[PDB]
Design an enzyme around this catalytic site. Sequence first.
Site, PDB file in Angstrom:
ATOM      1  N   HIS A 169       0.800  -1.211   0.000  1.00  0.00           N
ATOM      2  CA  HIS A 169       0.000   0.000   0.000  1.00  0.00           C
ATOM      3  C   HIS A 169       0.851   1.289   0.000  1.00  0.00           C
ATOM      4  CE1 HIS A 169      -0.616  -0.301   4.680  1.00  0.00           C
ATOM      5  NE2 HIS A 169       0.393   0.515   4.426  1.00  0.00           N
TER       6      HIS A 169
ATOM      7  N   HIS B 242      -1.416   6.337   8.082  1.00  0.00           N
ATOM      8  CA  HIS B 242      -0.035   6.840   8.348  1.00  0.00           C
ATOM      9  C   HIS B 242       0.084   8.222   9.010  1.00  0.00           C
ATOM     10  CE1 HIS B 242      -0.012   3.550   5.563  1.00  0.00           C
ATOM     11  NE2 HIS B 242       1.202   3.247   6.000  1.00  0.00           N
TER      12      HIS B 242
ATOM     13  N   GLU C 273       4.708  -4.110   9.468  1.00  0.00           N
ATOM     14  CA  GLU C 273       3.253  -3.986   9.340  1.00  0.00           C
ATOM     15  C   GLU C 273       2.644  -5.251   8.731  1.00  0.00           C
ATOM     16  OE1 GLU C 273       2.082  -0.659   6.757  1.00  0.00           O
ATOM     17  OE2 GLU C 273       3.574  -1.182   5.296  1.00  0.00           O
TER      18      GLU C 273
HETATM   19 FE   LIG Z   1       1.432   1.110   6.101  1.00  0.00          FE
END
Ligand SMILES: [Fe+2]
Lengths: 404, 399
Positions: free
Chosen positions: A11, A58, A238
């Site tokens: 992503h 983020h 992540e």
């Molecule tokens: Fe991320």
Amino acid sequence: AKIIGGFAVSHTPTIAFAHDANKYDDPVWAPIFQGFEPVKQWLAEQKPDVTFYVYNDHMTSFFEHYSHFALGVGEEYSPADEGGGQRDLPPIKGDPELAKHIAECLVADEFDLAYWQGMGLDHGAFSPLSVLLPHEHGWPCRIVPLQCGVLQHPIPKARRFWNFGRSLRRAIQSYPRDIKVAIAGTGGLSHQVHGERAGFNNTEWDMEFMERLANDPESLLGATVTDLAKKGGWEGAEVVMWLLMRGALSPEVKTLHQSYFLPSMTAIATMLFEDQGDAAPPAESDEALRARAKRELAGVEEIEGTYPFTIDRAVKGFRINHFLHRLIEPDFRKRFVEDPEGLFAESDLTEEEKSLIRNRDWIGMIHYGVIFFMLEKMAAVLGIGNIDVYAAFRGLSVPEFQKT
Amino acid sequence: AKIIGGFAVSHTPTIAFAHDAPIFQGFEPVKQWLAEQKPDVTFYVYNDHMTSFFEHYSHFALGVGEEYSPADEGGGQRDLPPIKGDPELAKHIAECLVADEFDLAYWQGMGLDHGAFSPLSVLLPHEHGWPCRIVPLQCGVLQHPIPKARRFWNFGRSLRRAIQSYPRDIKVAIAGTGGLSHQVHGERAGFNNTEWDMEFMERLANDPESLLGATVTDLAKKGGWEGAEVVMWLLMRGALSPEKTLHQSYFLPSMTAIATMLFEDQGDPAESDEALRARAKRELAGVEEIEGTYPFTIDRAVKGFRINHFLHRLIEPDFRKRFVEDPEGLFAESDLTEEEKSLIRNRDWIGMIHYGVIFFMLEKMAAVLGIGNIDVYAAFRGLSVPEFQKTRNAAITYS
Ligand SMILES: [Fe+2]
Ligand SMILES: [Fe+2]
């Protein structure tokens, strides 16, 4: 209630920016996009009603208040401004009903959640969605975003993620509606984007991680944040979100697709897994589960004069609760007093909602789904005493009501 | 180290309204007990009432920051000096609970509403400064579904052993606030059960576990809808010894039953603090051996909070207009240290990372100044841009 499979995709904001710049032809980006193609097609062939979409924000919509598993219960979601202005994409529909049921099933399973509405989706969601789904007009499916707070440690353990996905699968399957659901885990693979170590990658680890996630994911449930970060870079850790997704799928899956490109910082990877369905019959039945979740509010409707504040309610009163909530902003409540009309005309509130405020209609606001505390603010602000509000609720005169 | 017990109480805002009476007298034994045992930190369980917590609404929101000022509830900032938090303690609490598989949220900088400050004002002297430090836990009991009663209990249970693992000699008071019985909304607004009130305040102390089967429907039918918030007492209750009441209370001047309970910690386990401190540390153990890497743990979130918060604002169009055209004005209005202003002025990427700026804020700044992530990464590596691109498989730029 049908889980058709899941997909996993990086992503990184670079996917979005290559899309928005139409680098589909670009010598560098052409083959990356081609890697998206089988996921794009599957989604187009399979036609999921809903994608349950696991990502992390983020430090954009989640910062001063930062939660581990924040479930989006909202009606729609638009691109977040990440400093350069909103990307040009239509809003995408949420699924409050699915989200509600999921929340109920997950709370029942002793997962603590957060609920949220109205906030932008950042590159964590829209970067890959913009390349996997046609959007030139609207989006082909609804979404139920699950934002995971993987940035601020301590974060939940890799096994905790997997377990969330194990409960999630049963939550969706037991959803008593006949729809198709796909699951998306997103983020990764190796990268680090901070510190003197910025630029670290490890294809060997990425390739190993994908293979294990596909064929032996329970093998990963012991990795610490330190293991993940050492092997896949700090931000690469992540990938616990892919674990979450994989947990929601069948024990064994068919891997229809895998691709990998490491053009600069991020290993841009995608996987497509086809659910094989429950190997066994499941431990707890779709019936015992639905009731187990229904339990805590079983009978609550027997209680009269009472309008419980459930996700559906919260979603129904959001526009006007959001509005009334702003009464904590000084110029706002000041505008609320001196010039209520230009403020109403400033809002996205409907004529009905505006009417309810103008009429100072207290019990109809509760009826319509306004939570009291927002009336507590409105009343505080207009110089009305709380007692009057309870008088109007009960259908009584203040003195009438003051019988106690 | 250890806990001195913990008080229970109503967070009704009328307790606040009033201060500008065997009720304020109900708060006496508490009020003195607070000076007696003299608490290092108060772990304060309350709920925000749709003021600071609305659009993003979580189950257990742990306050990790350094201080707390009173939230504007529409009536304005309630003249009160800020109260101090315990980030070190909060970190440990977070670490220990997470290892216990409780899912949390962390928060700094947002105001505290009446559900916190009302009681504290009649609880502790605010005149000049507060008599202790706070670790707030804001529980989302307003938006359903919410955690199970047993759930609130077990979090309390972990909180205890967590706070008992803190490597210190300090004493902690564990608050827990709400109710008691009432309904503030609907035609059934005004509801009360004192018979239930007494059965509750009494069942909590002597027979806490027996409440751990009650559902939302039960708590609402008996205590009114908002009365169900009393699960925040269970949580408090879980943080204490398996088994003395130093005080109680009651009166019904209005909608809200106003109750108090003052408990003294009588002491108790299954896992040595050598094992518990280590188990908590396990996820991030060894991580100091990874070079060029600055993990964003809570201590870091707190140290870099002001400047993260500032650059965060770069998402607002107007703020970033100012940032570009008139940065000095912006710095002057800020709460930044001149050190922090300097880092930003210097566009010192590596420095901000070292100081605790999280990268994604830098990403915002970079873009706003019309410079790419690549320039940022290159700077991190002490390289020029082309020299950094040599290490990439394909050179590309983007913001
Ligand atoms: Fe991320
Ligand atoms: Fe409350």
